Design a binder for this molecule. Structure first.
Ligand SMILES: N[C@@H](Cn1ccc(=O)[nH]c1=O)C(=O)O
Ligand SMILES: N[C@@H](Cn1ccc(=O)[nH]c1=O)C(=O)O
Ligand SMILES: [Zn+2]
Ligand SMILES: [Zn+2]
Lengths: 260, 260
């Protein structure tokens, strides 16, 4: 056996740098939901591993011109990593080039507003211009709007793609900061899981409104045909059935909430 | 190519017999969410099919003594059917003998009460005896309680397994009828999807209370190693991404609701 290389991404509260990480070594430098999940998966599958942060800090997309895959998906496709354990959305285009376990978390696209903003739904956003709105610049949320045939979402994409200045952000933290510093003039579309986490963090000035726009899940990914695929899938099902996944979400989202 | 044999189960609103089914033929005898889903999957995967109702009317369990699998799972394992398209829960023990697509629907175990019953949670049920409660006699809901290590659910299973008369029912319709005819002295534990459907059907005397006890999903199943597996999985992802699955749930659950 050989040490398994795990690729993941810095995204709270899935993977975060510990306070004195600069003086720590190996897997000890990180903490979070996916760090805990990686330890459980490795134990039940019988392997040793090394956590690494994706080089380009992206989730995974295919360049239309070069046909090259970037992000965590790219690291698996080109053999730079053996497995990805992160909040990676299961999608058709990705399933065609890598394998995914059954979902370890369920979620959907949602709306985040600065408290007091006069918006209650996607419909509301699409019918006005005073309040700007956008999504992560690369990922499944942006693709959802780009390819949607649904009236409201199609109208939203038409606005977002031409809006100036750009309404797209580089990271989740950037989107949250923009909502907080825009005095209610910017609303952010992001996955419900991240929205729910931020709502319980100081300065407690944001909130999730309306229902989710869709339904999907995050899965553990492996290179197509990997010998680890089968065991990892069974491990995810085992951990969910014994209540470990629910325990971990409570641990990183609510047990330590800062807003009451 | 050969006609694909689909096994499914009579469970509203997934698969139901049309009014004059006795005078109809083939796939035309049935209607419902899974009937519509089967047509879409077959079209996108390029195959012709024949719908059949599982012989023993069960979902799928393995006899501890004979080691024989029954229900829809059994039909796939022994080669009596080529694919199962029904509200079949993705579980570890089943994943070990058959293949599942990514989920086409997300759900969780829930509580159904006759309106007015003084119960608001699983905790409430576990701390009293006046109001009896049970689950489907065979399936993932019963297994959840049987194998749970969680205090409240463990206390609930201890009560249910010895309760007299039996608190377990043969079908969902039987459980609903018992709730309706017991004057509030029987509460039923069932999947949220079925609970949500019944709440919108006359005589509009039931309701779902509390949150779900767990989180899981339904998947399309095929015999392990089947050549249909890959295409069926991609088709489920395609249908979810284009909004067809959400449209179908609204069509069979809410568009025709009977309770306002
Ligand atoms: N999980 C996504 C990435 N991602 C993350 C947060 C968010 O709000 N939107 C999004 O697309 C993916 O896998 O691309
Ligand atoms: N989907 C289940 C069957 N099933 C259906 C309804 C319900 O309330 N509980 C249950 O276990 C399975 O696959 O066993
Ligand atoms: Zn463990
Ligand atoms: Zn279609």
């Amino acid at each position: 056996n050989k040490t398994v290389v795990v690729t993941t991404i810095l995204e709270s509260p899935y993977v975060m740098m510990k306070k004195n990480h600069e003086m720590l070594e190996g897997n000890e430098r990180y903490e979070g939901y996916c760090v805990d999940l990686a330890a459980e998966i490795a134990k039940h599958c019988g392997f040793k591993y090394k956590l690494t942060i994706v080089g380009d800090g992206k989730y995974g997309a295919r360049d239309a011109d070069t046909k090259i895959w970037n992000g965590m998906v790219g690291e698996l496709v080109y053999g730079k990593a053996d497995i990805a354990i992160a909040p990676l959305t299961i999608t058709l285009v990705r399933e065609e080039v890598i394998d995914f376990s059954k979902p370890f978390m369920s979620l959907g696209i949602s709306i985040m507003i600065k408290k007091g903003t006069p918006i209650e739904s996607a419909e509301d956003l699409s019918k006005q211009t005073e309040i700007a709105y956008g999504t992560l610049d690369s990922g499944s949320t942006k693709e959802f709007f780009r390819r949607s045939k649904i009236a409201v979402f199609d109208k939203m994409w038409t606005y977002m793609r031409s809006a100036e200045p750009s309404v797209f952000v580089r990271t989740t933290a950037e989107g949250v900061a923009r909502v907080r510093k825009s005095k209610g003039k910017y609303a952010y579309l992001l996955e419900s899981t991240m929205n729910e986490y931020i709502e319980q963090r100081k300065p407690c000035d944001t909130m999730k409104v309306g229902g989710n726009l869709d339904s999907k899940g995050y899965g553990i990914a492996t290179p197509k045909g990997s010998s680890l695929g089968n065991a990892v899938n069974l491990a995810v099902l085992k951990l969910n059935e014994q209540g470990l996944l629910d325990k971990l979400k409570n641990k990183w989202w609510y047990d330590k909430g800062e807003c009451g």
